Amino acid sequence: VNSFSGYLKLTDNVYIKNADIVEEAKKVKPTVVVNAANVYLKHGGGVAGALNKATNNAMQVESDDYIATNGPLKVGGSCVLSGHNLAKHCLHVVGPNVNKGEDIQLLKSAYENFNQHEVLLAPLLSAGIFGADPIHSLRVCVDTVRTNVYLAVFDKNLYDKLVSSFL
Ligand SMILES: OC1(CNc2ncnc3[nH]ccc23)CCCCC1
Numbered sequence: 001v002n003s004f005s006g007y008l009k010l011t012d013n014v015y016i017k018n019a020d021i022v023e024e025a026k027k028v029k030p031t032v033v034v035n036a037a038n039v040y041l042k043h044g045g046g047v048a049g050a051l052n053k054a055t056n057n058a059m060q061v062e063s064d065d066y067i068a069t070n071g072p073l074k075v076g077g078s079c080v081l082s083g084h085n086l087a088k089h090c091l092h093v094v095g096p097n098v099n100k101g102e103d104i105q106l107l108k109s110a111y112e113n114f115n116q117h118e119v120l121l122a123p124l125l126s127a128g129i130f131g132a133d134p135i136h137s138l139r140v141c142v143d144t145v146r147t148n149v150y151l152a153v154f155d156k157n158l159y160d161k162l163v164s165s166f167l
């Protein structure tokens with residue numbers, strides 16, 4: 001039993017809700033919140049900009065030190081950093097950016113990072129401002145993630161579409 005409330009069960013291990021991941025994080029304080037990161041950990045907009053704003057820019061300050069030490073992430077890769085006031089940890093995961101010509105096959109690699117964590121609050125990677133179809137992101141999620149994932153979908157219209165077309 002966990003404290004996620006109001007989620008629609010989609011499969012054995014995937015749950016979904018129309019919500020802002022920032023608000024879900026502030027209410028639940030999960031062990032792991034997933035950020036829809038880019039390779040430079042520049043949290044300007046979308047999920048990343050919203051999460052970083054909620055940390056009063058502490059996420060960005062920590063991220064800049066991470067990059068200065070380690071260099072950029074790989075597309076499909078991830079790193080674990082602090083969750084600040086939103087979660088214990090933030091798993092920064094880089095899905096491919098369709099607008100940059102990046103390989104959508106890397107979306108599966110991106111979701112594989114979730115399997116290193118027993119329970120996560122997460123967005124549909126590569127969707128939103130990253131350019132991919134959220135319906136596709138959801139199918140890759142369900143077919144790749146084996147740990148327990150709670151998805152927060154920001155847009156009500158797309159959520160209803162994601163639910164309606166699922167089975
Ligand atoms: O959910 C997405 C990605 N974008 C966000 N998701 C959750 N919470 C958020 N807070 C700010 C942005 C944001 C991907 C699926 C279709 C709708 C948009």
Ligand SMILES: [Cl-]
Pocket residue numbers: 045046047127128129130
């Ligand atoms: Cl977005």
